[PDB]
C-alpha cells in the first residue's frame, strides 16, 4: 500500500489574546489576536516535521513544489493565513524554490511561494463566526447537565476571581474568556496578576480546557459546526480516487474549534482543547483497487469505531460512516403559515 | 513640509503561462496554464524591492521591519495573484527583516497576511464570462471596434489556417495574441508558417483591443467603479481615523489597472504588462491633504490636478462623486 493523498487541518500558532485582564498590564509585542513570532516558529517547525513525514518518509510529495499539487484554504483571519504561510515555509523551505536563467533564484534564498486562498469572514466552513458560535453554545451547551454541574462546582470561586481580575466572572463562559488570557500569559512567561495564586490560575486554565473540550463531546454540537468541513474532507479523499482532483493534499488552516468539531463529528471527541499548531490528517492509501484510510491527530493514529486493530478502514466504510452521521443529524423540515 | 501618510496600490500579477493553446503549436511552458512562472515571481519580487526603496527608504512611510496590521492586502481568487502578492511582499519586507524569538523562521522570512476575495467577486476582476458579456454589449459593436475589425478582417482566414484556432473577430485575435505574448516572453519559436510580421500584427491588435475596451468610461465604471470608490475610501479612512493601515494593496490583473485608470478618465493607451502597478499617494501638510496618482513609475495628471500632478483629497472626492452621479442607473419598477 502507498500513501496517495492527505487532507489536513491545523490550528494556528501562538497568538496574542483577544481580551485583556482588566487588573493586569500585560504587553504582548503584537496586536490582539495576531500570530506572534513564537507562533510563526511553531508552524514553521510543524512544516519541517510534515516534510520529513510526507516527503522524506512516504514520498507522497516531491522535494520541490509542484504547482497545483496542494490546495490550501484558510479562514479569513491574519493568524490562520500567516500560520499556513509559516507552515509552508517549513514544508517547502528556502533552497527548494524555483530558478530562472542559469540556476539563478526566482526569489532570493530560493523561497517557494505556495498559494493560500481564504474563505470570507462570514463563512462557517472552517470556523463559525464568534457570535454564531456562542449562540450555538447558549442553546445546546450552557444548560446541559454537565455544564450546569461543573458550573455549580466552580461557582464558589467566581466572586473572588472577579475581584482579583476585574473582568466579569458569572459563569464558565467568563472563566473561559479570562482563561485564554492566562494561557497566553503563561506561554509568554508573564507574571501572574496580583492576588491570583498559581493554584487559582491553574484552576481557571483547567476549567478553560475542560470547557472547550466539553462543548464538542456532543456529536450534535460538533455536527452543527463541523459537519460541512468533515463532509468536505471526506469528499477530498473521494476526489483523489475518482479522478476529479489531482491534488496530493488539501490543507485547511483553522482553529481550535476546527479540530474539535471534526473530531467530534466523527465520534472521537478530544478530551483536551487543542494547543497551538495541533493538527489532524486523513491519510488515503492505495493497494491495487483497495483504498484505505487512517486518521492522525497530533502525531498519533486515532481509531474510529469502524476501524480495525490497525487503526484503518476502507474508504467505502468511511463513506458509509459519514452517510449515517449525515442521516442521524438531518433536519426535519416544516412548512409555515 | 508635506509628508506621505498613506498609499493605496494595485498590481497586475507577474509573467504567467497562457490560458489557451495554439492548436498548431507544441509549446511546453514548465508550469500549468494560467499559473505564475518563476520569472513572474522574480518580476514581482523585484517590484517589491523597488517599492521598499521608494516607500521605506525614500519616503519613510513604512518601517524597515514589518508592523502587524500596517498593510492590508487583498487579492483576487487566483493562484497567480496570491503568489504575485506573496512574491512582491518578499521584496518589500525581505529575508533578514522578519521576526526574532534566533529567527522565527529560517533566513528571517517575514509573513504578511493576504486575504482573497471569492471567485465570484467582481471587485478586483469580473469573472471572465461576465467580462466578455460586458464587451459583447458595450464594446464589440462600437464604431471603433467595427472599424478596426474591418481593417484586420482580411487576415483572419490566413491566421486561422496557420494557427488552427478559430479566428473570426478581434476577440479571437486577442485570444491567440495572449499565447503569442507568452511565447515571446519565453523565447519560444514562432508557430510554423506565422511570420514575425504576422505575430507582431496579432500582438499589436491584442494590445490595441485591451486598451480600447476601457477608453469607454462607462465600460470602465461598470467593472471598476467599485474598486475605484473603495481605494478613494481607503484614502479617506487614513484621514478620518477609521483605519490605521499605512497601505492598502489590491493584487489584481490587467483589467484591474485598465478599469481604475479608465474610471478616473485617464484610460491607458496600451495594455498593462506584467507587474504593472498603480499607486494613489496621500500627503499631509498640517490640515491640508493632497493626492497624487502614479502609474508604472510616472505621475498621472487627472483633469482636476494642477501643474504638479496634485489635487486635494476634497477635490478627488468631488471628482469621484461626479463620476458616480454620471453613471448612476435609472431604476424602474415592473409588472
Ligand atoms: N473575543 C473573541 N473574538 C473573536 N473570536 C474569539 C474570541 N474569543 C475566542 N474566539 C474564538 O473561539 C475559539 C475558542 O477559544 C478560538 O479559537 P482559536 O484561538 O482561533 O484557535 C477563536 O477562534
Ligand atoms: N481563457 C481565460 N480564462 C479565464 N480568464 C481569462 C482568460 N483569458 C483572459 N482572461 C482574463 O482576461 C484578462 C485580459 O486578457 C486577463 O488578465 P490577467 O492576465 O489575469 O492580468 C485575465 O484575467
PDB file of N, CA and C in Angstrom, chain A residues 29-38 40-42 44-45 66-68 71 73 75-78 81-82 85-86 89 94 98-100 105-109 111-120 247, chain B residues 30-39 41-43 45-46 67-69 72 74 76-79 82-83 86-87 90 95 99-101 103-107 109-118 245:
ATOM      1  N   UNK A  29       3.605  42.707  22.536  1.00  0.00           N
ATOM      2  CA  UNK A  29       4.555  42.895  21.448  1.00  0.00           C
ATOM      3  C   UNK A  29       3.932  42.653  20.084  1.00  0.00           C
ATOM      4  N   UNK A  30       2.662  42.268  20.099  1.00  0.00           N
ATOM      5  CA  UNK A  30       1.893  42.254  18.861  1.00  0.00           C
ATOM      6  C   UNK A  30       0.442  42.488  19.171  1.00  0.00           C
ATOM      7  N   UNK A  31      -0.305  42.810  18.120  1.00  0.00           N
ATOM      8  CA  UNK A  31      -1.700  43.204  18.288  1.00  0.00           C
ATOM      9  C   UNK A  31      -2.550  42.027  18.756  1.00  0.00           C
ATOM     10  N   UNK A  32      -3.638  42.335  19.451  1.00  0.00           N
ATOM     11  CA  UNK A  32      -4.554  41.300  19.910  1.00  0.00           C
ATOM     12  C   UNK A  32      -4.956  40.372  18.779  1.00  0.00           C
ATOM     13  N   UNK A  33      -4.936  39.081  19.090  1.00  0.00           N
ATOM     14  CA  UNK A  33      -5.320  38.003  18.176  1.00  0.00           C
ATOM     15  C   UNK A  33      -4.342  37.703  17.038  1.00  0.00           C
ATOM     16  N   UNK A  34      -3.248  38.454  16.929  1.00  0.00           N
ATOM     17  CA  UNK A  34      -2.277  38.189  15.867  1.00  0.00           C
ATOM     18  C   UNK A  34      -1.312  37.075  16.244  1.00  0.00           C
ATOM     19  N   UNK A  35      -0.805  36.377  15.231  1.00  0.00           N
ATOM     20  CA  UNK A  35       0.223  35.369  15.429  1.00  0.00           C
ATOM     21  C   UNK A  35       1.516  36.042  15.889  1.00  0.00           C
ATOM     22  N   UNK A  36       2.143  35.486  16.922  1.00  0.00           N
ATOM     23  CA  UNK A  36       3.408  36.006  17.437  1.00  0.00           C
ATOM     24  C   UNK A  36       4.586  35.358  16.701  1.00  0.00           C
ATOM     25  N   UNK A  37       5.805  35.887  16.892  1.00  0.00           N
ATOM     26  CA  UNK A  37       6.989  35.218  16.337  1.00  0.00           C
ATOM     27  C   UNK A  37       7.104  33.761  16.810  1.00  0.00           C
ATOM     28  N   UNK A  38       6.772  33.495  18.070  1.00  0.00           N
ATOM     29  CA  UNK A  38       6.767  32.123  18.562  1.00  0.00           C
ATOM     30  C   UNK A  38       5.790  31.266  17.749  1.00  0.00           C
ATOM     31  N   UNK A  40       4.751  31.781  14.651  1.00  0.00           N
ATOM     32  CA  UNK A  40       5.331  31.552  13.330  1.00  0.00           C
ATOM     33  C   UNK A  40       6.316  30.390  13.384  1.00  0.00           C
ATOM     34  N   UNK A  41       7.171  30.401  14.403  1.00  0.00           N
ATOM     35  CA  UNK A  41       8.156  29.349  14.590  1.00  0.00           C
ATOM     36  C   UNK A  41       7.514  27.979  14.804  1.00  0.00           C
ATOM     37  N   UNK A  42       6.429  27.927  15.567  1.00  0.00           N
ATOM     38  CA  UNK A  42       5.744  26.663  15.807  1.00  0.00           C
ATOM     39  C   UNK A  42       5.203  26.071  14.515  1.00  0.00           C
ATOM     40  N   UNK A  44       6.222  26.853  11.392  1.00  0.00           N
ATOM     41  CA  UNK A  44       7.377  26.539  10.555  1.00  0.00           C
ATOM     42  C   UNK A  44       7.952  25.162  10.931  1.00  0.00           C
ATOM     43  N   UNK A  45       8.109  24.926  12.229  1.00  0.00           N
ATOM     44  CA  UNK A  45       8.623  23.646  12.698  1.00  0.00           C
ATOM     45  C   UNK A  45       7.679  22.483  12.383  1.00  0.00           C
ATOM     46  N   UNK A  66       5.330  21.289  -6.633  1.00  0.00           N
ATOM     47  CA  UNK A  66       4.657  21.175  -7.921  1.00  0.00           C
ATOM     48  C   UNK A  66       3.402  22.032  -7.930  1.00  0.00           C
ATOM     49  N   UNK A  67       3.285  22.937  -8.896  1.00  0.00           N
ATOM     50  CA  UNK A  67       2.118  23.809  -8.894  1.00  0.00           C
ATOM     51  C   UNK A  67       0.838  22.990  -9.023  1.00  0.00           C
ATOM     52  N   UNK A  68      -0.169  23.395  -8.254  1.00  0.00           N
ATOM     53  CA  UNK A  68      -1.485  22.761  -8.220  1.00  0.00           C
ATOM     54  C   UNK A  68      -1.465  21.398  -7.538  1.00  0.00           C
ATOM     55  N   UNK A  71      -3.772  22.119  -2.281  1.00  0.00           N
ATOM     56  CA  UNK A  71      -4.814  23.119  -2.186  1.00  0.00           C
ATOM     57  C   UNK A  71      -4.833  23.598  -0.749  1.00  0.00           C
ATOM     58  N   UNK A  73      -6.619  26.287   1.928  1.00  0.00           N
ATOM     59  CA  UNK A  73      -7.735  27.180   2.206  1.00  0.00           C
ATOM     60  C   UNK A  73      -7.686  27.546   3.675  1.00  0.00           C
ATOM     61  N   UNK A  75      -9.259  30.120   6.956  1.00  0.00           N
ATOM     62  CA  UNK A  75     -10.282  31.044   7.413  1.00  0.00           C
ATOM     63  C   UNK A  75      -9.796  32.474   7.185  1.00  0.00           C
ATOM     64  N   UNK A  76     -10.727  33.418   7.253  1.00  0.00           N
ATOM     65  CA  UNK A  76     -10.430  34.818   6.970  1.00  0.00           C
ATOM     66  C   UNK A  76      -9.869  35.521   8.208  1.00  0.00           C
ATOM     67  N   UNK A  77      -8.707  35.063   8.674  1.00  0.00           N
ATOM     68  CA  UNK A  77      -8.022  35.731   9.783  1.00  0.00           C
ATOM     69  C   UNK A  77      -6.536  35.825   9.486  1.00  0.00           C
ATOM     70  N   UNK A  78      -5.896  36.854  10.022  1.00  0.00           N
ATOM     71  CA  UNK A  78      -4.469  37.005   9.799  1.00  0.00           C
ATOM     72  C   UNK A  78      -3.711  35.812  10.369  1.00  0.00           C
ATOM     73  N   UNK A  81      -3.885  32.694   8.099  1.00  0.00           N
ATOM     74  CA  UNK A  81      -3.154  32.823   6.839  1.00  0.00           C
ATOM     75  C   UNK A  81      -1.649  32.793   7.093  1.00  0.00           C
ATOM     76  N   UNK A  82      -1.195  33.568   8.075  1.00  0.00           N
ATOM     77  CA  UNK A  82       0.225  33.598   8.410  1.00  0.00           C
ATOM     78  C   UNK A  82       0.702  32.240   8.945  1.00  0.00           C
ATOM     79  N   UNK A  85       1.207  30.126   5.856  1.00  0.00           N
ATOM     80  CA  UNK A  85       2.412  30.594   5.172  1.00  0.00           C
ATOM     81  C   UNK A  85       3.651  30.062   5.882  1.00  0.00           C
ATOM     82  N   UNK A  86       3.639  30.159   7.206  1.00  0.00           N
ATOM     83  CA  UNK A  86       4.782  29.741   8.014  1.00  0.00           C
ATOM     84  C   UNK A  86       4.998  28.234   7.918  1.00  0.00           C
ATOM     85  N   UNK A  89       6.525  27.360   4.689  1.00  0.00           N
ATOM     86  CA  UNK A  89       7.948  27.687   4.673  1.00  0.00           C
ATOM     87  C   UNK A  89       8.798  26.566   5.274  1.00  0.00           C
ATOM     88  N   UNK A  94      13.246  27.401   2.149  1.00  0.00           N
ATOM     89  CA  UNK A  94      14.232  28.144   1.389  1.00  0.00           C
ATOM     90  C   UNK A  94      15.306  27.185   0.884  1.00  0.00           C
ATOM     91  N   UNK A  98      11.881  27.982  -6.923  1.00  0.00           N
ATOM     92  CA  UNK A  98      12.222  27.902  -8.347  1.00  0.00           C
ATOM     93  C   UNK A  98      13.414  28.744  -8.766  1.00  0.00           C
ATOM     94  N   UNK A  99      14.018  28.329  -9.876  1.00  0.00           N
ATOM     95  CA  UNK A  99      15.116  29.040 -10.511  1.00  0.00           C
ATOM     96  C   UNK A  99      14.648  29.654 -11.823  1.00  0.00           C
ATOM     97  N   UNK A 100      15.311  30.736 -12.219  1.00  0.00           N
ATOM     98  CA  UNK A 100      15.194  31.274 -13.565  1.00  0.00           C
ATOM     99  C   UNK A 100      16.584  31.212 -14.177  1.00  0.00           C
ATOM    100  N   UNK A 105      18.086  32.198  -8.624  1.00  0.00           N
ATOM    101  CA  UNK A 105      16.827  32.027  -7.886  1.00  0.00           C
ATOM    102  C   UNK A 105      15.751  33.019  -8.325  1.00  0.00           C
ATOM    103  N   UNK A 106      14.511  32.553  -8.462  1.00  0.00           N
ATOM    104  CA  UNK A 106      13.395  33.449  -8.769  1.00  0.00           C
ATOM    105  C   UNK A 106      13.227  34.483  -7.654  1.00  0.00           C
ATOM    106  N   UNK A 107      13.404  34.033  -6.418  1.00  0.00           N
ATOM    107  CA  UNK A 107      13.334  34.899  -5.254  1.00  0.00           C
ATOM    108  C   UNK A 107      14.576  34.601  -4.437  1.00  0.00           C
ATOM    109  N   UNK A 108      15.178  35.627  -3.850  1.00  0.00           N
ATOM    110  CA  UNK A 108      16.390  35.409  -3.066  1.00  0.00           C
ATOM    111  C   UNK A 108      16.187  34.300  -2.030  1.00  0.00           C
ATOM    112  N   UNK A 109      17.240  33.511  -1.828  1.00  0.00           N
ATOM    113  CA  UNK A 109      17.216  32.374  -0.909  1.00  0.00           C
ATOM    114  C   UNK A 109      16.337  31.236  -1.418  1.00  0.00           C
ATOM    115  N   UNK A 111      13.133  31.086  -1.991  1.00  0.00           N
ATOM    116  CA  UNK A 111      11.824  30.941  -1.362  1.00  0.00           C
ATOM    117  C   UNK A 111      10.846  30.298  -2.331  1.00  0.00           C
ATOM    118  N   UNK A 112       9.897  29.548  -1.785  1.00  0.00           N
ATOM    119  CA  UNK A 112       8.852  28.907  -2.568  1.00  0.00           C
ATOM    120  C   UNK A 112       7.461  29.453  -2.226  1.00  0.00           C
ATOM    121  N   UNK A 113       6.905  30.301  -3.102  1.00  0.00           N
ATOM    122  CA  UNK A 113       5.520  30.735  -2.887  1.00  0.00           C
ATOM    123  C   UNK A 113       4.551  29.593  -3.168  1.00  0.00           C
ATOM    124  N   UNK A 114       3.560  29.435  -2.297  1.00  0.00           N
ATOM    125  CA  UNK A 114       2.506  28.440  -2.484  1.00  0.00           C
ATOM    126  C   UNK A 114       1.194  29.142  -2.176  1.00  0.00           C
ATOM    127  N   UNK A 115       0.250  29.152  -3.126  1.00  0.00           N
ATOM    128  CA  UNK A 115      -0.952  29.973  -2.942  1.00  0.00           C
ATOM    129  C   UNK A 115      -1.841  29.498  -1.798  1.00  0.00           C
ATOM    130  N   UNK A 116      -2.373  30.469  -1.071  1.00  0.00           N
ATOM    131  CA  UNK A 116      -3.332  30.247   0.001  1.00  0.00           C
ATOM    132  C   UNK A 116      -4.592  31.039  -0.339  1.00  0.00           C
ATOM    133  N   UNK A 117      -5.730  30.358  -0.449  1.00  0.00           N
ATOM    134  CA  UNK A 117      -6.997  31.059  -0.608  1.00  0.00           C
ATOM    135  C   UNK A 117      -7.612  31.262   0.765  1.00  0.00           C
ATOM    136  N   UNK A 118      -8.446  32.289   0.913  1.00  0.00           N
ATOM    137  CA  UNK A 118      -9.212  32.459   2.142  1.00  0.00           C
ATOM    138  C   UNK A 118     -10.698  32.411   1.865  1.00  0.00           C
ATOM    139  N   UNK A 119     -11.426  31.841   2.815  1.00  0.00           N
ATOM    140  CA  UNK A 119     -12.870  31.975   2.858  1.00  0.00           C
ATOM    141  C   UNK A 119     -13.211  33.420   3.166  1.00  0.00           C
ATOM    142  N   UNK A 120     -14.488  33.762   3.053  1.00  0.00           N
ATOM    143  CA  UNK A 120     -14.946  35.045   3.558  1.00  0.00           C
ATOM    144  C   UNK A 120     -15.061  34.976   5.075  1.00  0.00           C
ATOM    145  N   UNK A 247      -4.975  17.070  -6.800  1.00  0.00           N
ATOM    146  CA  UNK A 247      -4.231  17.469  -5.609  1.00  0.00           C
ATOM    147  C   UNK A 247      -3.680  16.248  -4.871  1.00  0.00           C
TER     148      UNK A 247
ATOM    149  N   UNK B  30       6.374  24.641 -18.717  1.00  0.00           N
ATOM    150  CA  UNK B  30       7.068  24.399 -17.461  1.00  0.00           C
ATOM    151  C   UNK B  30       6.206  24.647 -16.233  1.00  0.00           C
ATOM    152  N   UNK B  31       5.047  25.269 -16.438  1.00  0.00           N
ATOM    153  CA  UNK B  31       4.035  25.298 -15.380  1.00  0.00           C
ATOM    154  C   UNK B  31       2.658  25.225 -15.984  1.00  0.00           C
ATOM    155  N   UNK B  32       1.672  25.008 -15.123  1.00  0.00           N
ATOM    156  CA  UNK B  32       0.301  24.810 -15.572  1.00  0.00           C
ATOM    157  C   UNK B  32      -0.264  26.087 -16.181  1.00  0.00           C
ATOM    158  N   UNK B  33      -1.232  25.924 -17.076  1.00  0.00           N
ATOM    159  CA  UNK B  33      -1.902  27.068 -17.680  1.00  0.00           C
ATOM    160  C   UNK B  33      -2.370  28.063 -16.629  1.00  0.00           C
ATOM    161  N   UNK B  34      -2.121  29.333 -16.923  1.00  0.00           N
ATOM    162  CA  UNK B  34      -2.522  30.471 -16.091  1.00  0.00           C
ATOM    163  C   UNK B  34      -1.758  30.654 -14.780  1.00  0.00           C
ATOM    164  N   UNK B  35      -0.805  29.775 -14.477  1.00  0.00           N
ATOM    165  CA  UNK B  35      -0.037  29.911 -13.244  1.00  0.00           C
ATOM    166  C   UNK B  35       1.120  30.884 -13.410  1.00  0.00           C
ATOM    167  N   UNK B  36       1.507  31.524 -12.311  1.00  0.00           N
ATOM    168  CA  UNK B  36       2.686  32.375 -12.296  1.00  0.00           C
ATOM    169  C   UNK B  36       3.948  31.537 -12.519  1.00  0.00           C
ATOM    170  N   UNK B  37       4.816  31.988 -13.420  1.00  0.00           N
ATOM    171  CA  UNK B  37       6.080  31.305 -13.696  1.00  0.00           C
ATOM    172  C   UNK B  37       7.176  31.795 -12.745  1.00  0.00           C
ATOM    173  N   UNK B  38       8.320  31.095 -12.707  1.00  0.00           N
ATOM    174  CA  UNK B  38       9.447  31.603 -11.916  1.00  0.00           C
ATOM    175  C   UNK B  38       9.852  33.022 -12.323  1.00  0.00           C
ATOM    176  N   UNK B  39       9.826  33.344 -13.613  1.00  0.00           N
ATOM    177  CA  UNK B  39      10.165  34.711 -13.991  1.00  0.00           C
ATOM    178  C   UNK B  39       9.120  35.703 -13.453  1.00  0.00           C
ATOM    179  N   UNK B  41       7.431  35.352 -10.641  1.00  0.00           N
ATOM    180  CA  UNK B  41       7.758  35.522  -9.225  1.00  0.00           C
ATOM    181  C   UNK B  41       8.880  36.539  -9.080  1.00  0.00           C
ATOM    182  N   UNK B  42       9.888  36.418  -9.940  1.00  0.00           N
ATOM    183  CA  UNK B  42      11.028  37.320  -9.912  1.00  0.00           C
ATOM    184  C   UNK B  42      10.630  38.760 -10.222  1.00  0.00           C
ATOM    185  N   UNK B  43       9.722  38.941 -11.172  1.00  0.00           N
ATOM    186  CA  UNK B  43       9.266  40.281 -11.519  1.00  0.00           C
ATOM    187  C   UNK B  43       8.572  40.959 -10.348  1.00  0.00           C
ATOM    188  N   UNK B  45       8.873  40.095  -7.100  1.00  0.00           N
ATOM    189  CA  UNK B  45       9.884  40.262  -6.056  1.00  0.00           C
ATOM    190  C   UNK B  45      10.702  41.544  -6.290  1.00  0.00           C
ATOM    191  N   UNK B  46      11.140  41.741  -7.528  1.00  0.00           N
ATOM    192  CA  UNK B  46      11.885  42.944  -7.881  1.00  0.00           C
ATOM    193  C   UNK B  46      11.059  44.218  -7.728  1.00  0.00           C
ATOM    194  N   UNK B  67       5.314  45.949  10.486  1.00  0.00           N
ATOM    195  CA  UNK B  67       4.437  46.178  11.630  1.00  0.00           C
ATOM    196  C   UNK B  67       3.102  45.486  11.394  1.00  0.00           C
ATOM    197  N   UNK B  68       2.698  44.610  12.307  1.00  0.00           N
ATOM    198  CA  UNK B  68       1.443  43.907  12.082  1.00  0.00           C
ATOM    199  C   UNK B  68       0.280  44.893  11.974  1.00  0.00           C
ATOM    200  N   UNK B  69      -0.602  44.607  11.022  1.00  0.00           N
ATOM    201  CA  UNK B  69      -1.792  45.410  10.740  1.00  0.00           C
ATOM    202  C   UNK B  69      -1.463  46.748  10.088  1.00  0.00           C
ATOM    203  N   UNK B  72      -2.819  46.265   4.484  1.00  0.00           N
ATOM    204  CA  UNK B  72      -3.941  45.403   4.183  1.00  0.00           C
ATOM    205  C   UNK B  72      -3.756  44.914   2.757  1.00  0.00           C
ATOM    206  N   UNK B  74      -5.327  42.463  -0.233  1.00  0.00           N
ATOM    207  CA  UNK B  74      -6.482  41.724  -0.730  1.00  0.00           C
ATOM    208  C   UNK B  74      -6.212  41.332  -2.173  1.00  0.00           C
ATOM    209  N   UNK B  76      -7.462  38.941  -5.723  1.00  0.00           N
ATOM    210  CA  UNK B  76      -8.490  38.152  -6.377  1.00  0.00           C
ATOM    211  C   UNK B  76      -8.247  36.675  -6.074  1.00  0.00           C
ATOM    212  N   UNK B  77      -9.263  35.859  -6.334  1.00  0.00           N
ATOM    213  CA  UNK B  77      -9.215  34.438  -6.012  1.00  0.00           C
ATOM    214  C   UNK B  77      -8.527  33.649  -7.129  1.00  0.00           C
ATOM    215  N   UNK B  78      -7.248  33.940  -7.363  1.00  0.00           N
ATOM    216  CA  UNK B  78      -6.456  33.174  -8.332  1.00  0.00           C
ATOM    217  C   UNK B  78      -5.077  32.886  -7.755  1.00  0.00           C
ATOM    218  N   UNK B  79      -4.485  31.778  -8.185  1.00  0.00           N
ATOM    219  CA  UNK B  79      -3.160  31.446  -7.699  1.00  0.00           C
ATOM    220  C   UNK B  79      -2.161  32.525  -8.096  1.00  0.00           C
ATOM    221  N   UNK B  82      -2.351  35.666  -5.854  1.00  0.00           N
ATOM    222  CA  UNK B  82      -1.892  35.447  -4.484  1.00  0.00           C
ATOM    223  C   UNK B  82      -0.375  35.280  -4.452  1.00  0.00           C
ATOM    224  N   UNK B  83       0.149  34.447  -5.348  1.00  0.00           N
ATOM    225  CA  UNK B  83       1.589  34.212  -5.406  1.00  0.00           C
ATOM    226  C   UNK B  83       2.326  35.493  -5.813  1.00  0.00           C
ATOM    227  N   UNK B  86       2.532  37.576  -2.671  1.00  0.00           N
ATOM    228  CA  UNK B  86       3.497  36.995  -1.747  1.00  0.00           C
ATOM    229  C   UNK B  86       4.925  37.281  -2.207  1.00  0.00           C
ATOM    230  N   UNK B  87       5.142  37.200  -3.515  1.00  0.00           N
ATOM    231  CA  UNK B  87       6.462  37.446  -4.088  1.00  0.00           C
ATOM    232  C   UNK B  87       6.854  38.909  -3.939  1.00  0.00           C
ATOM    233  N   UNK B  90       7.839  39.626  -0.464  1.00  0.00           N
ATOM    234  CA  UNK B  90       9.178  39.113  -0.186  1.00  0.00           C
ATOM    235  C   UNK B  90      10.264  40.101  -0.604  1.00  0.00           C
ATOM    236  N   UNK B  95      13.882  38.752   3.304  1.00  0.00           N
ATOM    237  CA  UNK B  95      14.584  37.895   4.237  1.00  0.00           C
ATOM    238  C   UNK B  95      15.668  38.703   4.938  1.00  0.00           C
ATOM    239  N   UNK B  99      10.768  38.449  11.939  1.00  0.00           N
ATOM    240  CA  UNK B  99      10.820  38.490  13.403  1.00  0.00           C
ATOM    241  C   UNK B  99      11.802  37.518  14.034  1.00  0.00           C
ATOM    242  N   UNK B 100      12.234  37.870  15.240  1.00  0.00           N
ATOM    243  CA  UNK B 100      13.096  37.033  16.062  1.00  0.00           C
ATOM    244  C   UNK B 100      12.309  36.512  17.258  1.00  0.00           C
ATOM    245  N   UNK B 101      12.723  35.358  17.772  1.00  0.00           N
ATOM    246  CA  UNK B 101      12.226  34.871  19.055  1.00  0.00           C
ATOM    247  C   UNK B 101      13.372  34.898  20.058  1.00  0.00           C
ATOM    248  N   UNK B 103      15.935  33.451  14.723  1.00  0.00           N
ATOM    249  CA  UNK B 103      14.857  33.791  13.782  1.00  0.00           C
ATOM    250  C   UNK B 103      13.599  32.952  14.003  1.00  0.00           C
ATOM    251  N   UNK B 104      12.427  33.581  13.916  1.00  0.00           N
ATOM    252  CA  UNK B 104      11.162  32.849  13.990  1.00  0.00           C
ATOM    253  C   UNK B 104      11.066  31.842  12.843  1.00  0.00           C
ATOM    254  N   UNK B 105      11.541  32.252  11.673  1.00  0.00           N
ATOM    255  CA  UNK B 105      11.595  31.382  10.507  1.00  0.00           C
ATOM    256  C   UNK B 105      12.997  31.510   9.942  1.00  0.00           C
ATOM    257  N   UNK B 106      13.561  30.408   9.461  1.00  0.00           N
ATOM    258  CA  UNK B 106      14.920  30.453   8.929  1.00  0.00           C
ATOM    259  C   UNK B 106      15.054  31.555   7.874  1.00  0.00           C
ATOM    260  N   UNK B 107      16.217  32.204   7.874  1.00  0.00           N
ATOM    261  CA  UNK B 107      16.507  33.325   6.975  1.00  0.00           C
ATOM    262  C   UNK B 107      15.698  34.572   7.330  1.00  0.00           C
ATOM    263  N   UNK B 109      12.511  35.152   7.292  1.00  0.00           N
ATOM    264  CA  UNK B 109      11.378  35.460   6.428  1.00  0.00           C
ATOM    265  C   UNK B 109      10.329  36.240   7.205  1.00  0.00           C
ATOM    266  N   UNK B 110       9.605  37.099   6.500  1.00  0.00           N
ATOM    267  CA  UNK B 110       8.528  37.883   7.087  1.00  0.00           C
ATOM    268  C   UNK B 110       7.170  37.527   6.478  1.00  0.00           C
ATOM    269  N   UNK B 111       6.349  36.765   7.215  1.00  0.00           N
ATOM    270  CA  UNK B 111       4.980  36.515   6.742  1.00  0.00           C
ATOM    271  C   UNK B 111       4.134  37.779   6.844  1.00  0.00           C
ATOM    272  N   UNK B 112       3.370  38.064   5.795  1.00  0.00           N
ATOM    273  CA  UNK B 112       2.428  39.179   5.788  1.00  0.00           C
ATOM    274  C   UNK B 112       1.113  38.654   5.231  1.00  0.00           C
ATOM    275  N   UNK B 113       0.012  38.794   5.985  1.00  0.00           N
ATOM    276  CA  UNK B 113      -1.227  38.126   5.566  1.00  0.00           C
ATOM    277  C   UNK B 113      -1.811  38.696   4.284  1.00  0.00           C
ATOM    278  N   UNK B 114      -2.323  37.790   3.462  1.00  0.00           N
ATOM    279  CA  UNK B 114      -3.014  38.119   2.224  1.00  0.00           C
ATOM    280  C   UNK B 114      -4.415  37.506   2.306  1.00  0.00           C
ATOM    281  N   UNK B 115      -5.451  38.335   2.212  1.00  0.00           N
ATOM    282  CA  UNK B 115      -6.807  37.811   2.120  1.00  0.00           C
ATOM    283  C   UNK B 115      -7.176  37.672   0.653  1.00  0.00           C
ATOM    284  N   UNK B 116      -8.098  36.763   0.346  1.00  0.00           N
ATOM    285  CA  UNK B 116      -8.635  36.673  -1.005  1.00  0.00           C
ATOM    286  C   UNK B 116     -10.128  36.911  -1.016  1.00  0.00           C
ATOM    287  N   UNK B 117     -10.575  37.569  -2.073  1.00  0.00           N
ATOM    288  CA  UNK B 117     -11.986  37.627  -2.403  1.00  0.00           C
ATOM    289  C   UNK B 117     -12.442  36.234  -2.795  1.00  0.00           C
ATOM    290  N   UNK B 118     -13.749  36.052  -2.918  1.00  0.00           N
ATOM    291  CA  UNK B 118     -14.262  34.830  -3.512  1.00  0.00           C
ATOM    292  C   UNK B 118     -14.092  34.897  -5.027  1.00  0.00           C
ATOM    293  N   UNK B 245      -4.184  51.490   8.765  1.00  0.00           N
ATOM    294  CA  UNK B 245      -3.290  50.977   7.727  1.00  0.00           C
ATOM    295  C   UNK B 245      -2.449  52.103   7.116  1.00  0.00           C
TER     296      UNK B 245
END
